[PDB]
Amino acid sequence: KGEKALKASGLVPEHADAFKKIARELNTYILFRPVNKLATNLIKSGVATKGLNVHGKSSDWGPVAGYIPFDQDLSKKHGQQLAVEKGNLENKKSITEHEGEIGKIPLKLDHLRIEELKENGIILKGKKEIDNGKKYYLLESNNQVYEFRISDENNEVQYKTKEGKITVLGEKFNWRNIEVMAKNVEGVLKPLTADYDLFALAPSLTEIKKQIPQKEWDKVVNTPNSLEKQKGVTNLLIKYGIERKPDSTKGTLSNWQKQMLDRLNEAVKYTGYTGGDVVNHGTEQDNEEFPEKDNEIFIINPEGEFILTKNWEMTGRFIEKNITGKDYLYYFNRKAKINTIPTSAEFIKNLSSIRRSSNVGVYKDSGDKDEFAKKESVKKIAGYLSDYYNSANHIFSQEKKRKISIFRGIQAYNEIENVLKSKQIAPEYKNYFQYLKERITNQVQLLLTHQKSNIEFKLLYKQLNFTENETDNFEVFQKIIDEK
């Protein structure tokens, strides 16, 4: 929060002042991911940064830690049993799939970086061995299965494992280099650095009116009906915001948030970075190959107080205190799921996660109409969960957001009840749907108790009958909320 986040993240102070100027002149809650200081030294060195072509995470030891090495054993793949070749062939695929901006260059790092690692207390510049015809700059480490050899007169690392001990990869190499994957800046020698990443983004919707076209905002203000005005804003957001474009070098943003990103990219050139775009891949949940979870988030407020969190429940608490529970644009990263269960795209990910391993399930690769009817049921599930994950219901108060949230939970629970009115499905998806419906009952239940409803869930389910209408059955449900 201010200074403690700025020191425990290891964030660039001139970039901190630049981000305060960006937040002051653009009024956006800039969410961020935790960055490694060992990567931050090579970021503030100025050379190019990685995207999603490589996937090397931040290491825990090394002068090259932060760069993406050829052999990934100077990367996140440290001590991995069968995953060192996963990272190895992953950077092979980075070389041989994304041609044009992936290079084969030598290293670009600091010679005093070994002293930057000895002031970190990691490597041990000790005994010297003779290779390349010279008494070379062989330096040891603490973890002595590996050692770096940064060159004396050159700016390269001819690293090796010791020739008289075992390698954790299973091979043996004699003072080989890091043939580091690069970014071909029309021929400029620039390797890849572990980039500074995003977490989400959140402007205010009144500012968003001055970014998206607003003569349909001059249309949508002249309505006499409240829920239909909210549904017109729903039409505006379904055709404007979430209609995304999948990439791997810019990110999963709105086009106006892509303008936010390229403004962020240009506004850091004169501050101390020599490459421009330092944010070159997606957020925490945008790595859909496998998600992760962090314990602190560098959310930057519009007014200069760089907010920090402590626990994941405190992340949800301060998001529903600041991002969600105000009149802002909560645009997040799409049995203790107290508030935020994952999104419906990850529900489709879990749908494919046990439809390929076990080929049986809800509907098969077929042509019959009942299979497409269960496909229509899960289509309504995937629609209703993204309807539930639409926090832009706040042109009115936020209890309207609460009422529409519990309404969408009711409708999705009705769909999960409908999908068990089907044929003899595989029991894996049966207990999966039991899991979904029980977590959604717990979610709508505590969402009701944080309201002042005092009704149990089963009463409120059995009273509603939405045959053809979310227009007066919302008035049926809505009337109870309107009174006590």
Rounded to 5 degrees, φ, ψ at 330 are: -70, 95
Is-contact 148 124, C-beta < 8 A? Answer: no
Across the chain, how many H-helices and E-strands are there?
Answer: 16, 6
Buried b (16+ CB within 10 A) or exposed e, 288-324: eeeeeeeebbbbbbbeeebbbbeebeebebbbbebbb
Q: Alpha-carbon distance 11 to 15, whole Å? A: 8
Helix (H) / strand (E) element for 227: namely helix 226-240
Question: Which tokens in the block code for residue 200?
Answer: 């989400």
Residue 228 CA to residue 220 CA, distance in Å, equals 10
Amino acid at position 437, single letter: K
> Which 8-state DSSP code applies to residue 268?
T
What is the set of active-site residues? 55
Integer Cα distance of 277 and 155 in angstroms: 24
Determine the length of the chain.
Answer: 484
Asked whether 69 and 180 are in contact (CB, 8 A), the reply is: yes
Cα separation, 298 vs 286, in Å, equals 17
355-375: burial string, b at 16+ Cβ within 10 Å, e else: beeeeebbbeeeeeeebeebe
CA distance 381 to 415: 6
Tokens representing 329?
Answer: 């644009």
**Are the beta carbons of 93 and 65 closer than 8 angstroms?**
no
Hey, which residues does 182 pair with through a beta bridge? Answer: 191
- Concatenating the DSSP letter of every residue in 150-169 gives B-SSSS-B--B--TTS--SS
Provide the residue type at 96 as one letter.
T
Distance CA 44, CA 60 (A): 18
Pick from 35, 50, 55, 32: which is nearest to 333 by CA? 32
Pairing relationship of beta strands 306-307 and 198-203 according to DSSP bridges: unpaired
In 3-state terms, what secondary structure has residue 147?
Answer: strand
Residue 143 has which token pair?
């973890």
Residue 427 is given by DSSP the state H
User: Are the C-beta atoms of residues 34 and 297 closer than 8 Å to each other?
Assistant: yes
283 is in an annotated binding site: yes
How do strand 306-307 and strand 299-300 relate by DSSP bridges?
antiparallel
Please give the DSSP secondary-structure letter assigned to residue 331: B
Q: Which helix (H) or strand (E) holds 306?
A: strand 306-307
Q: Nearest to residue 388, comparing CAs of 433, 447, 429?
A: 447
Report how far residue 136's alpha carbon sits from residue 130's, in angstroms, rounded to the nearest whole number: 6
Give Cα 103 distance to the centre of its chain: 26
Alpha carbon dihedral 339, 342, 347, 349, in 10-degree steps, equals -160
Instruction: Identify the burial level of 198 via C-beta atoms within 10 angstroms of its C-beta, where 0-12 means exposed, 13-18 middle and 19 or more buried.
Output: buried
In the numeric block, the tokens 């892509």 are attached to: 258
CB-based contacts of 60: which residues, under 8 Å, 6+ apart?
78
Six-digit token string for 23 = 């937040």
Where in 154-238 does DSSP place strands (E)? Answer: 198-203
**DSSP string of 105-142?**
------STHHHHHHTTT--B-----EETTEE----B-S
Which amino acid, 103?
G
Whether 56 has a binding-site annotation, put simply, is no
Q: Residue 100 burial by CB count (10 A; 0-12/13-18/19+): exposed, middle or buried? A: exposed
Nearest to 463 by CA among 481, 449, 447: 481
Helical segments of 248-288, H only? 255-266
71 is in an annotated binding site: no
C-alpha torsion sign, points 162, 168, 173, 179: negative
Q: Alpha-carbon distance 344 to 355, whole Å?
A: 16
Q: Is 98 annotated as contributing to ligand binding?
A: no
Task: Give 357-403 as a DSSP string.
Answer: SS--SSS-S---HHHHHHHHHHHHHHHHHHHHT-----SS-HHHHHH
Residue 269 CB neighbour total at 10 angstroms: 13
Which single residue is written with the structure tokens 């405190």?
314
b/e sequence 140-168, b meaning 16+ C-beta within 10 Å = bbeeeebbbbbbeeeebbbbbbeeeeeee
Q: What is the DSSP string of 400-415?
A: HHHHHHHHHHHHHHHH
60 is in an annotated binding site: no
Give the phi and the psi of residue 216 in degrees, each rounded to 5.
-70, -20
Q: Any known ligand binding at 281? A: yes
Are 272 and 12 within 8 A, CB to CB?
Answer: yes
Residues 276 and 265: beta-carbon distance below 8 Å = yes
Per the CB < 8 A criterion, the answer to whether 223 and 26 are in contact is: no
